[PDB]
Design a protein around this ligand. Structure first.
Ligand SMILES: NC(=O)c1ccc[n+]([C@@H]2O[C@H](COP(=O)([O-])OP(=O)(O)OC[C@H]3O[C@H](n4cnc5c(N)ncnc54)[C@H](O)[C@@H]3O)[C@@H](O)[C@H]2O)c1
Ligand SMILES: NC(=O)c1ccc[n+]([C@@H]2O[C@H](COP(=O)([O-])OP(=O)(O)OC[C@H]3O[C@H](n4cnc5c(N)ncnc54)[C@H](O)[C@@H]3O)[C@@H](O)[C@H]2O)c1
Lengths: 428, 459, 217
């Protein structure tokens, strides 16, 4: 069975791990250490690249590392003045920092990491240091604030002037996690440290299409913060977002995900609920990069069969409101693709000239903003669009039968959106 | 307590909390400072001793179970504390001092081990501990604090709450059902679902909506709700709505004002408009109920007008670029982007060829941009002038740009980075002159130094 | 936070019952002078007009005579003293010195950190450069790991060296200390021994401290 498959793989992996632990008891000059590090490295690499159920195997594997010498072994080795051993240990840590192993590093030895970060020269090292940083910024606001206060953001912002493919892929995925996880305070600091301006060389990349996609979630997330919006704009990095989202195909970066071993199922129900507030910003740049990601995920999650996510996150209602009031082709293309992949009724765009709407255009808009329960009463009373732009609380309450004062507050909020989109050429 | 503080007791607990000999002596000398710091009136002198400094580091160091083994595995303090010494640690969990909430959760953890071994965990329910630990977990912003409060809630077999996502404005209907279940209104979940309260609707709930629409009949229940809500409003991230950091201006008056952020920013007040708001508006629009609060917010507002007057600002409207980065679309991309940043950081309007197309309007706006920009930076990357070679048809954009730059007598600075110098004759005459200009070698290592050199050359 | 409860009780013992109502609106003694009767009534919940009017009247007299003026606390980040000590041995004496001196109004910088790691010789060294005085707990084995540490790895070592280099006022506190041979220490720190040590009396702590204070700048 599934469980058995996992177990049987571990039944070889766990023993093998214990052996490399012995080579990690034997303090070679660079020998038994270097080898032993590389040994377990390969042993977990196999488990990560397992084309079957491998995530669970490698989860079990990483857990056992923590419950047997922990990361403490490696964290001491991260101080060892032998470049080779430092480097081999860096590599190993980067690939084993799961949730529980990140909680540990956050406590036991974040100060080790932030000292390794001061060393910026060996690229084999830098690759992995930057990689550790990537997963550590995904921990908690506290850990973010700590990695920013000590020069851990200042390292990922120096490794943006470098050229190594994977180093840069680490550096952008990192400013990604840091904006997404760091909070109001960290976002201000990243912006003040000129992070937008330093994402420019990664979004304007010609070499990698993922490096630009990752460096664009970073700017698009920062621009969602109203207080740093105007400085993020002044960098001219937001410029590049919309052109690129256009360029690429959702399904293809879902094939760089589900057809790959890394990010197999893409994102989980908590990394998905960080893309939904992108769809709801006022930045086109952010709503596009948001709808690109949600499209890619809707492919993966439909292949699997878990599209219930999208309902509880609140994605579906947010994509069908990028479709209704959209004024951009890119944005709507993706938001329609998504709403189709998740088998929903793709809404039609609302005709903007509301003053001129008749009774049928009002029934339509009620059905797209999910008041389809008040359709009958808006029909009985023949609300057309001059009557709608003029509705009052009393009319809503008494005549339409919207009893709840919360429902009326929810209605008048939808209405204030429509009033803001409306063409008033006929009256004004 | 006042007297102990006046007799310099905090300062004299320093040599016991900074002990290296005993781990219990420090633990005991830390309950002492943490209890004193809970007293708002002596808080600032307890702090000035620098003894509170040591509390949090130490609680981290130690293990709950081990000081429960220095208790239950010992004869002294076998069952640790009894139901009346335990109800003196619960008001530590509820202070605003992290130092105290940590030392409090350490002690309650140790006791939860002992009391679970025995079987008397009913204490923790009547003391009111369990609801207080599951509120150090919900709104915690410290690892130590939450570690212990989760360990405890597990040892006493409770449902360890998940931490609340802080960006409340952005919450949907499911994040509201979750927070209702963690603050123990799980009875009003159905009605908050029927009416689809999401988080903009929650930060805005009024007594009437609570009473009529949600069916919170009791006016005590509503007072208990609005107290939980005022906690959440104070924890909330408002980055999406606040543009002026009104939340940190309101918190600098008085920490419990920060809860009025959303109400003020949902009327589109900001720091630059507060100086003109009126009391009736603070009351009717922004929803600040306590007159005493209204009058302070208001008073401080009119002092912005006075000293920190938010005056009119101004951003660079110089459409004219300073620099034009010309580069091989495929090769120089990288170096061009780097130049863009460095120069932009040093305050130079930079025009790069953002366009990936190199088509559409052939040699159109880009050429005007050259004519617009005083300086012309040329990424001499490998093969930069190869498609410019014998392009007398002036079709290559690089070509055109160079020619345009020469023609205007623009300051041209090439950036040698791989570049094999070609023979002038191999280039069209209109662009052979490019080679006369001194190139600067780019150091992939000494980026900053290189950039200073480049800046010397610019006009 | 302001002992409003004892200001209210000094008007009239049966006013002390209004403390919570007033402090749950975040009034304090420094804000009472500006509260109004309607607010005492509607916010703080004082029902009897006769009471409202007394609380109010007395409030405006604070404004007059016991005016709560703006205060100011030491913002001198610069320490006066730096206590350098063997992390294991001198801990005790260092802590004692910290208190005594702090009571006598000396900003004291001890090495609170238990780590002696992380950022190796970083902020601690700036702290030395920051502080006018450099107090050195000469506890047993204080200069033993400083002996022939030409690699300048020992923190005590570094701190001493930094102190010497800045020409800081160094005062060692002899407490068990067997004086070593200069040559056994790196030259950069041999000069530490030239400074007159003060013997610590575990009994006459106060007297000892007065002696120490004579030496400080
Ligand atoms: N093939 C590989 O080389 C490979 C694969 C994945 C991760 N890694 C390594 O693994 C380490 C662990 O980090 P992580 O990615 O586990 O951290 P994480 O769990 O915080 O990352 C979020 C994860 O959520 C998603 N997800 C979807 N369904 C999930 C489920 N059922 N359970 C958990 N997550 C689910 C993705 O798997 C995504 O990786 C990283 O340091 C990384 O270097 C490498
Ligand atoms: N093994 C020892 O040497 C030892 C043991 C305990 C106390 N003592 C001595 O006993 C003296 C008596 O003081 P005390 O500790 O009884 O004072 P106390 O009762 O006021 O102390 C509080 C006690 O409550 C706790 N407690 C838990 N369950 C209890 C229960 N069922 N009944 C009562 N308390 C319960 C602990 O036992 C704790 O000691 C102290 O002066 C002390 O020196 C020494």
């Amino acid at each position: 069975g599934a469980g058995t498959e996992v177990q049987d793989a571990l039944e070889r992996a766990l023993p093998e791990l214990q052996q490399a632990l012995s080579a990690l008891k034997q303090a070679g000059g660079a020998r038994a250490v270097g080898a032993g590090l590389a040994e377990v490295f390969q042993l977990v690499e196999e488990a990560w690249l397992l084309p079957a159920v491998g995530r669970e195997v490698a989860q079990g594997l990483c857990d056992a590392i923590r419950l047997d010498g922990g990361l403490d072994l490696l964290l001491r080795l991260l101080q060892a003045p032998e470049l080779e051993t430092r480097v081999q240990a860096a590599r190993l840590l980067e690939q084993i920092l799961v949730a529980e192993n990140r909680d540990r590093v956050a406590r036991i030895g974040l100060g080790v990491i932030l000292n390794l970060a001061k060393e910026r020269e060996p690229v084999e090292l830098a690759r992995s240091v930057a990689g550790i940083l990537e997963h550590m910024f995904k921990h908690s606001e506290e850990t973010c604030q700590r990695l920013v206060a000590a020069g851990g953001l200042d390292a990922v912002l120096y490794w943006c002037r470098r050229t190594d493919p994977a180093l840069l892929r680490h550096c952008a995925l990192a400013l990604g996690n840091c904006a997404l996880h760091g909070g109001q305070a960290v976002q201000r600091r990243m912006v003040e440290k000129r992070a937008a301006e330093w994402l420019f060389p990664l979004a304007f990349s010609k070499e990698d299409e993922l490096l630009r996609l990752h460096a664009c979630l970073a700017v698009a997330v920062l621009a969602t913060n109203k207080e740093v919006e105007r400085e993020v704009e002044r960098s001219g990095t937001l410029a590049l977002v919309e052109p690129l989202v256009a360029s690429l195909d959702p399904g293809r970066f879902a094939r760089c995900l589900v057809d790959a071993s890394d990010t197999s199922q893409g994102r989980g129900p908590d990394d998905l609920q960080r893309l939904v507030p992108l769809l709801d910003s006022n930045r086109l740049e952010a709503q596009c990069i948001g709808a690109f990601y949600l499209c890619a995920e809707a492919a993966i999650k439909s292949l699997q069969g878990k599209t219930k996510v999208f309902s509880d996150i609140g994605a579906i209602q947010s994509l069908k409101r990028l479709v209704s009031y959209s004024t951009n082709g890119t944005k709507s293309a993706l938001a329609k693709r998504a709403l189709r992949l998740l088998g929903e009724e793709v809404p039609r765009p609302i005709l903007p000239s509301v003053p001129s709407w008749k009774e049928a255009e009002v029934q339509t808009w009620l059905q797209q903003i999910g008041f389809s329960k008040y359709c009958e009463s808006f029909r009985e009373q023949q609300v057309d669009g001059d009557l709608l732009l003029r509705l009052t609380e009393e009319e809503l309450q008494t005549d339409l039968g919207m009893k709840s004062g919360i429902t009326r507050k929810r209605f008048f909020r939808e209405l204030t959106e429509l009033k803001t989109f409306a063409n008033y050429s006929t009256c004004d | 307590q006042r007297r102990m503080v006046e007799k310099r007791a905090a300062e004299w607990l320093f040599p016991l909390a900074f002990s290296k000999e005993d781990e219990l002596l420090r633990l005991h000398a830390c309950l002492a400072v943490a209890v004193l710091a809970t007293n708002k009136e002596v808080e600032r002198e307890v702090e000035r001793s620098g003894t509170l400094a040591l509390v949090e580091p130490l609680v981290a160091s130690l293990d709950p179970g081990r000081f429960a083994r220095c208790l239950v595995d010992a004869s002294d303090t076998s069952q640790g504390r009894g139901p009346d010494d335990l109800q003196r640690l619960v008001p530590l969990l509820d202070s605003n001092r992290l130092e105290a909430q940590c030392i409090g959760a350490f002690y309650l953890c140790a006791e939860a081990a002992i009391k679970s071994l025995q079987g008397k965990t009913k204490v923790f329910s009547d003391i009111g501990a369990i609801q207080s630990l599951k509120r150090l977990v919900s709104y915690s912003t410290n690892g130590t604090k939450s570690a212990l409060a989760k360990r405890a809630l597990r040892l006493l077999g409770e449902e360890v709450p998940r931490p609340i996502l802080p960006s409340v404005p952005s919450w949907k209907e499911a994040e509201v059902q979750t927070w209702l279940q963690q603050i123990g209104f799980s009875k009003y979940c159905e009605s908050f679902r029927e009416q689809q309260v999401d988080g903009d609707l929650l930060l805005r709930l009024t007594e009437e909506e609570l009473q009529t629409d949600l069916g919170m009949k009791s006016g005590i229940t509503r007072k208990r709700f609005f107290r939980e809500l005022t906690e959440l409003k104070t924890f909330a991230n408002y980055s999406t709505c606040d543009r002026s950091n009104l939340a940190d201006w309101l918190g600098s008056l008085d920490p419990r004002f920060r809860q009025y952020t959303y109400g003020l920013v949902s009327c589109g007040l900001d720091r630059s408009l507060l100086h003109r708001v009126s009391e009736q508006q603070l009351l009717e629009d922004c929803g600040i109920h306590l007159g005493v609060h209204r009058a302070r917010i208001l008073t401080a507002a009119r002092e912005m007008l006075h000293s920190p007057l938010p005056c009119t600002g101004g951003k660079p409207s110089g459409d004219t670029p300073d620099v034009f980065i010309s580069y091989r679309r495929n090769s120089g991309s990288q170096l061009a982007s780097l130049l863009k940043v460095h120069l932009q950081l040093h305050g130079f309007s930079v025009f790069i060829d953002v366009e990936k197309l190199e088509a559409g309007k052939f040699e159109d706006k880009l050429i005007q941009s050259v004519m617009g920009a005083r300086n012309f930076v040329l990424v001499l990357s490998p093969g930069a002038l190869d498609k410019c070679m014998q392009d007398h048809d002036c079709k290559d954009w690089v070509h055109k740009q160079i020619v345009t730059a020469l023609s205007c007598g623009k300051n041209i600075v090439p950036i040698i980075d791989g570049f094999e110098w070609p023979e002038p004759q191999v280039l069209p005459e209109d662009m052979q002159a490019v080679l006369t200009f001194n190139g600067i070698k780019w150091s992939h290592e000494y980026q900053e130094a290189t950039i200073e050199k480049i800046i010397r050359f610019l006009q």
